[PDB]
Design a protein around this ligand. Structure first.
Ligand SMILES: C/C=C(\C)CC/C=C(\C)CCC=C(C)C
Ligand SMILES: C/C=C(\C)CC/C=C(\C)CCC=C(C)C
Lengths: 152, 152
């Protein structure tokens, strides 16, 4: 559907596209991997236990992840191959998820400011994988399972 | 009252200490200056037009600025000299205020992430003064006027 983005369904879900209206919360699992042989995992919501929650802000102005998610039926499991053009911000995104996974609030001031502090002082996202990933740009495969969609 | 912090009242305000209870919003003006001869201004809420708003989070665990503000009567104008120990985070704080001053939301995702992006890519807070200030640590004088205190 979009440039530098190959989607492949793995397990079609029940029903047709749901109502991805602005302010909906989309609940899902993802596993993020490199495109090497070992297919190296970088993040996995199943590994951490809890599933992921986003909330569509502007259905007419979507974020790249929302492009991916909004193309999915409930209980769909889909593999999204993604060209460099769209993987650049992933490490900062991941950094933010990993902080939320420890109940640190990545948009609370005290953690936001410590984050900029360290980032600036030490030239690191905090994790070796994300830093390697930051210094060696590349495509990524996300495997995603859409679990629930709820409206405002 | 505290180490590496010299306060001097300039114009005593009406009444005695107000109720700085947790969740209060404190409304004030500040002007932030170096301790050189020219007394170089770095930030001034009067220059930008609007006064500043903070909201006490934990009255038993206060932030250094809250230490300063919570020691003030309404309409007080006070000068707070501050030793290196407490000025290190100022440039990141300032960066955040300058973004809020352009109605950019410094804890919204899209701006938070662009911010980390640039900070990491370019090794800058975005403004030459804050970067100079970041590479040459020092004390600072804040002059502050407390305007209003409102409770939850
Ligand atoms: C309300 C919006 C947010 C809190 C931003 C969260 C963003 C993500 C969780 C990225 C989605 C993960 C992928 C692997 C595409
Ligand atoms: C609700 C809390 C915040 C939005 C953080 C805002 C912090 C400041 C505005 C710093 C105060 C300015 C000084 C010069 C000490």
């Amino acid at each position: 559907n979009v440039e530098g983005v190959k989607k492949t369904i793995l397990h079609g879900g029940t029903g047709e596209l749901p109502n991805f209206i602005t302010g909906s919360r989309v609940i899902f699992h993802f596993r993020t991997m490199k495109c090497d042989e070992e297919r190296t995992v970088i993040d996995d919501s199943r590994q951490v236990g809890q599933p992921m929650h986003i909330i569509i802000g502007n259905m007419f102005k979507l974020e790249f992840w929302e492009i991916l998610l909004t193309s999915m039926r409930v209980h769909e499991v889909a593999e999204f191959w993604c060209d460099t053009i769209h993987t650049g911000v992933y490490p900062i995104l991941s950094r933010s998820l990993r902080q939320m996974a420890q109940g640190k609030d990545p948009t609370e001031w005290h953690v936001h400011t410590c984050g900029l502090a360290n980032m600036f002082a030490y030239h690191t996202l905090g994790y070796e994988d994300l830093d390697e990933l930051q210094k060696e740009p590349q495509p990524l495969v996300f495997v995603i399972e859409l679990l629930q969609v709820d409206a405002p």
